[PDB]
Amino acid sequence: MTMMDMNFKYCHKIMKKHSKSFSYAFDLLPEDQRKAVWAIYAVCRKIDDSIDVYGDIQFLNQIKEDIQSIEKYPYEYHHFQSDRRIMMALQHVAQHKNIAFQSFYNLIDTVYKDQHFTMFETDAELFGYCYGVAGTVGEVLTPILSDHETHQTYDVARRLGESLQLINILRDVGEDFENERIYFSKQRLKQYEVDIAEVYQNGVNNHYIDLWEYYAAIAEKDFRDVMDQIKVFSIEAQPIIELAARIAIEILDEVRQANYTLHERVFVEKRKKAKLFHEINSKY
Numbered sequence: 033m034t035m036m037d038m039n040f041k042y043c044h045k046i047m048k049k050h051s052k053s054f055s056y057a058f059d060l061l062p063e064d065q066r067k068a069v070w071a072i073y074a075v076c077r078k079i080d081d082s083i084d085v086y087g088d089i090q091f092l093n094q095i096k097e098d099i100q101s102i103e104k105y106p107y108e109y110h111h112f113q114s115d116r117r118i119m120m121a122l123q124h125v126a127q128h129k130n131i132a133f134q135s136f137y138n139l140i141d142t143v144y145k146d147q148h149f150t151m152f153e154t155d156a157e158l159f160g161y162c163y164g165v166a167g168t169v170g171e172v173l174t175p176i177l178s179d180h181e182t183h184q185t186y187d188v189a190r191r192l193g194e195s196l197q198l199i200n201i202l203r204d205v206g207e208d209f210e211n212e213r214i215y216f217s218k219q220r221l222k223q224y225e226v227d228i229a230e231v232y233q234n235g236v237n238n239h240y241i242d243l244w245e246y247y248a249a250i251a252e253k254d255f256r257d258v259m260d261q262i263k264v265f266s267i268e269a270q271p272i273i274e275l276a277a278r279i280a281i282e283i284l285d286e287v288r289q290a291n292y293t294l295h296e297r298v299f300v301e302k303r304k305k306a307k308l309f310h311e312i313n314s315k316y
C-alpha cells in the first residue's frame with residue numbers, strides 16, 4: 033500500500049460502516065470511480081456529522097477551509113485542519129476530475145443553516161433544502177459518474193440527488209420526528225390537515241397517507257425523468273444509477289406495505305437488492 037491507498041482505504045472504512053444502502057451500489061462501480069465516490073462520501077458525511085453529532089461550527093469551518101485550500105492550490109502540500117486522510121484523498125480526486133467546489137460550499141451553508149431547524153414554510157424551501165444537501169452532492173459526483181460535463185448531465189445528477197433526498201424523507205418521518213425534525217412543509221401539512229406528533233401518537237390516518245403520497249408522487253415522476261435520461265451517465269455507471277432509482281421505488285413500496293408506519297425503519301434486504309440488480313443489468 034502506498035500512503036494514498038491508505039487514505040482511500042480509510043475513506044472506504046467510513047462508507048462501509050455507516051452506509052447501509054449507498055455502499056452496495058457504489059462498490060459495484062469500477063475501481064477509479066469507486067475510490068473517488070468513497071472520498072466524496074467520506075467528506076460529505078463528515079460535513080453532515082460535524083453539526084449533527086460532533087457539535088462544532090469550527091470543525092465545519094475547518095472542512096470548508098481545507099476544501100478551499102484544495103481549490104486554490106490543487107498541487108501544493110496542505111496541513112489539513114479537518115480530517116487529513118479524507119482531504120488528501122479528495123485533493124487526489126480534484127487533481128484528476130473537475131470538482132464543482134461551489135457545490136461543496138452550498139452543501140456546507142445548508143448544513144450550517146440546518147443547525148437551527150426551522151420547519152419549512154413552503155415546498156419551495158423544502159426543495160431548496162433538498163438541493164442544498166443532496167442536489168449539490170449529485171453535482172459533485174457528476175464528473176465521476178459521467179464523461180460529459182454538459183448542462184444536461186449536471187441537471188440529471190442534481191435531480192437524482194434531490195429525489196433520493198425526498199425518498200429518504202419519506203422513509204424516515206417517524207425517526208426524524210423523534211429527533212425533533214419534520215421535513216414536510218407547514219403549507220402542505222396545513223392543507224392536508226396533518227399533525228405529525230398527533231400521527232406519531234395515534235397511528236397513520238387518511239389525511240396522512242394522502243400527504244405522504246402527494247410527496248411520493250413527486251419523487252416517482254422525478255425518477256422516471258432521470259431514467260428517461262440515463263444515457264448522460266458513463267456506461268459503467270448507468271446500471272448502478274438505474275439500481276438506485278429502482279431501490280428508491282422499492283423503499284416507497286415497503287413503506288406502503290408497512291402501512292406508512294412511523295415506528296420502524298423499512299429497508300430493502302441486501303439479497304433483494306442483488307435480485308433487482310440482476311434483473312437490471314441483463315439489459316446491458
Ligand SMILES: C=C(CC[C@]12O[C@H](C(=O)O)[C@@](O)(C(=O)O)[C@](C(=O)O)(O1)[C@H](OC(=O)/C=C/[C@@H](C)C[C@@H](C)CC)[C@H]2O)[C@@H](OC(C)=O)[C@H](C)Cc1ccccc1
Nearest residue numbers: 050051052053054057072073076077080165169276279280
Ligand atoms: C450524510 C449523508 C449520508 C446520509 C445517509 O445516512 C444514513 C444513516 O446515517 O444511517 C445512511 O448511512 C443509511 O441509511 O445507512 C445512508 C446511506 O445508506 O449511505 O447515508 C442513507 O442513504 C440512503 O438511505 C440510501 C437509500 C437508497 C435509495 C440508496 C440508493 C440510491 C442505492 C444506490 C442516508 O440517509 C450524505 O451526505 C449529506 C450531506 O447528506 C451522503 C454522505 C452523500 C453522498 C452519497 C453518495 C455518494 C457520495 C456522497
